[PDB]
Amino acid sequence: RMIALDGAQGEGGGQILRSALSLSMITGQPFTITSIRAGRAKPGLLRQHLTAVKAATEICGATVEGAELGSQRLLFRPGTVRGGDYRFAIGSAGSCTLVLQTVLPALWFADGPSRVEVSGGTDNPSAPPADFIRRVLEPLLAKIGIHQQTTLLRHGFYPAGGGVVATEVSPVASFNTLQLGERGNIVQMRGEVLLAGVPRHVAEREIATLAGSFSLHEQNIHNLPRDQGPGNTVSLEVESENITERFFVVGEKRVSAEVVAAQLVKEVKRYLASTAAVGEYLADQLVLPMALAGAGEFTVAHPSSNLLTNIAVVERFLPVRFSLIETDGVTRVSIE
Numbered sequence: 001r002m003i004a005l006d007g008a009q010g011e012g013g014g015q016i017l018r019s020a021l022s023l024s025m026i027t028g029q030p031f032t033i034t035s036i037r038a039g040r041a042k043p044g045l046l047r048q049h050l051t052a053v054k055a056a057t058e059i060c061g062a063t064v065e066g067a068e069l070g071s072q073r074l075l076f077r078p079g080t081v082r083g084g085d086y087r088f089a090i091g092s093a094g095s096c097t098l099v100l101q102t103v104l105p106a107l108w109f110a111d112g113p114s115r116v117e118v119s120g121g122t123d124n125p126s127a128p129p130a131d132f133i134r135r136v137l138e139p140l141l142a143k144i145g146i147h148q149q150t151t152l153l154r155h156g157f158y159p160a161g162g163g164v165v166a167t168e169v170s171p172v173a174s175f176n177t178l179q180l181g182e183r184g185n186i187v188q189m190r191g192e193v194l195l196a197g198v199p200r201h202v203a204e205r206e207i208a209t210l211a212g213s214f215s216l217h218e219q220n221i222h223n224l225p226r227d228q229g230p231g232n233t234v235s236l237e238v239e240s241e242n243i244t245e246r247f248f249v250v251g252e253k254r255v256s257a258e259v260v261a262a263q264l265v266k267e268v269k270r271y272l273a274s275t276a277a278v279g280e281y282l283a284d285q286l287v288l289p290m291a292l293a294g295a296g297e298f299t300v301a302h303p304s305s306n307l308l309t310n311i312a313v314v315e316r317f318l319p320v321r322f323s324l325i326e327t328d329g330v331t332r333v334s335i336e
């Protein structure tokens with residue numbers, strides 16, 4: 001019929017819109033959404049979100065009202081999803097991977113394989129980096145029966161953008177059940193620094209803090225052509241017996257190498273402080289694929305607003321329901 005969604009839900013960001021676009025394409029159910037990002041510094045559709053709407057529109061021949069920069073309202077009636085070889089340009093440092101994450105789930109069901117390439121930003125602090133998608137999310141997707149491979153082709157830092165990320169995706173043959181319990185013990189930890197036009201010694205300082213706090217099996221420093229923008233990110237990948245997670249921070253002006261790694265160091269100990277398998281962000285990114293599989297579960301410490309939003313949107317579009325039960329500070333998120 002028509003699903004009316006309130007864009008003020010949760011933290012009131014673009015996440016509710018991207019999740020709705022995915023589920024709408026998949027199920028054929030139209031939706032309307034009002035108050036899109038209405039309370040944010042730059043409200044309504046930004047170029048990342050408009051590019052997401054454009055891509056969804058193009059892949060499924062949708063009928064759409066309000067696809068314009070700044071629009072706080074959208075109505076979307078999906079048509080038939082077509083596989084193919086698609087290319088989209090954000091035109092800003094907006095997140096490539098968030099555009100990808102909007103349309104890839106629709107392509108899981110399409111006729112044959114597809115490829116999607118997006119240009120834009122690649123190292124936004126509040127989006128999944130390509131390496132997170134590739135090394136943390138995609139291995140779990142494969143366990144659920146979903147096969148996609150993401151590759152970062154070029155880095156694009158804020159504000160210039162001009163990075164490129166592409167994903168090859170195939171339709172699901174069959175779903176499997178993935179049940180994540182505890183993190184298990186550490187198998188190893190790997191620290192990584194990216195530099196583009198930033199003094200080499202910064203990376204050195206950053207790696208130091210991580211060590212002496214953790215035992216690192218790897219310590220990696222990646223240098224890019226400064227022309228690829230002034231940019232600096234610090235990552236820590238945590239491989240445990242049951243799962244691999246990965247966390248990152250983006251260095252900025254007025255912040256010291258020691259404290260950026262300090263922020264990252266803090267986040268990692270928050271993750272390690274609990275027995276939960278999945279970190280804060282990965283949790284929200286597993287909701288849709290598990291819902292589409294019709295089964296699955298994971299543990300997370302302190303379910304985020306985005307996790308709860310994604311669950312709510314999934315339950316509006318699909319006949320699945322999630323149970324959330326906390327045991328000793330860890331929440332088990334499961335399909336009933």
Ligand SMILES: Nc1ncnc2c1ncn2[C@@H]1O[C@H](COP(=O)(O)OP(=O)(O)OP(=O)(O)O)[C@@H](O)[C@H]1O
Nearest residue numbers: 013014015125126127128129132248281282284285
């Ligand atoms: N450090 C991180 N690692 C992995 N994924 C992340 C990280 N930060 C954010 N994400 C993912 O990016 C997505 C969007 O998160 P965010 O909270 O910025 O949404 P939002 O504020 O609604 O987005 P927008 O900026 O489009 O309004 C979520 O799926 C989240 O899990």
